[PDB]
Amino acid sequence: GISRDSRHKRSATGAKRAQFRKKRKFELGRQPANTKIGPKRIHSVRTRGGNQKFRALRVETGNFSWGSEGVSRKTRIAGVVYHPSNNELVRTNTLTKSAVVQIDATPFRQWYENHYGATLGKKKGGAHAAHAAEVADAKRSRKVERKLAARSGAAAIESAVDSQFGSGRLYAVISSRPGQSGRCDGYILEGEELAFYLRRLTA
């Protein structure tokens, strides 16, 4: 089938090599998963040594990390907005490693509000102001108020990340390999990398 041998290629001098042996099973390849966004379907692959791989054919949700805050939650993936290696993966929403994706920003919002007491979005419309007034006037016992005070000072976050919380979708980078592990995991874009990808996107 698909093969990874180096014998079928030309030498560095440019000579066309002669056939040495028939194809060997220890040098096979297989078909790309071409993971998509949809209801979960994961197929096992029996590999060498009796080990197992997982071809994520379709995935709904991934475990994403807010690196600075030291917390990660099992959000859900909206779409693919940028791929460094091929615009055909973004145009068809194909999930591989290093794909720039938008995830649901909601669970990180809940964690922010529960572990701090402040809110994000910062937009001053009707629903945004209503939710802000609700959050600022929540019911907090004195010990939880003091532990949140011990969590104060560093409450504010970088202006680029929280600005996007108006839309309920953040920007992330896939760090797992869905075709190899069956997981579609990543981390929130932050700082210099975030500015780079925003520059690439808005353009």
Partner: protein
């Protein structure tokens, strides 16, 4: 020479710059010592280039054989071919003939190499179709 000159973001793996940690609000930079007595260059440590195949600022280890040779091409992006001259002994005639081999090796942007210079290259994992060596030291041509 722009560091982020690709379609992807260039960074070292798992070196995180927490943008609000305490006081070191700088892009943290990792390196190693390649061992065997070889000196880590200063342009590698206080530098900004990103090279997954750098012996110092990358994830490749040096091990195996150490070779030296003369640089005959720098016409490739971040790799070189060196020329090793040697004499082959022919016992029937009790004499020698001049023989040579060409070796391709990775050259980190920490170095400034040009045709005519003598390099030392250490063996690394196969990082290309032809490359199994990596510049460690540069001398005058």
């Amino acid at each position: 020479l722009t560091v982020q000159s690709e379609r992807a973001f260039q960074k070292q793996p798992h070196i995180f710059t927490n943008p609000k940690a305490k006081a070191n609000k700088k892009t943290k930079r990792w390196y190693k010592d390649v061992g065997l007595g070889f000196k880590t260059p200063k342009a590698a440590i206080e530098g900004s280039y990103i090279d997954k195949k750098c012996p110092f600022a990358g994830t490749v280890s040096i091990r195996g054989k150490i070779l030296t040779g003369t640089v005959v091409s720098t016409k490739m992006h971040r790799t070189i071919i060196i020329r090793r001259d040697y004499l082959h002994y022919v016992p029937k005639y009790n004499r020698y003939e001049k023989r040579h081999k060409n070796v391709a090796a990775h050259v980190s942007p920490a170095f400034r190499v040009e045709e005519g210079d003598v390099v030392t290259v250490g063996q690394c994992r196969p990082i290309s179709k032809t490359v199994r060596f990596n510049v460690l030291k540069v001398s005058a041509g």
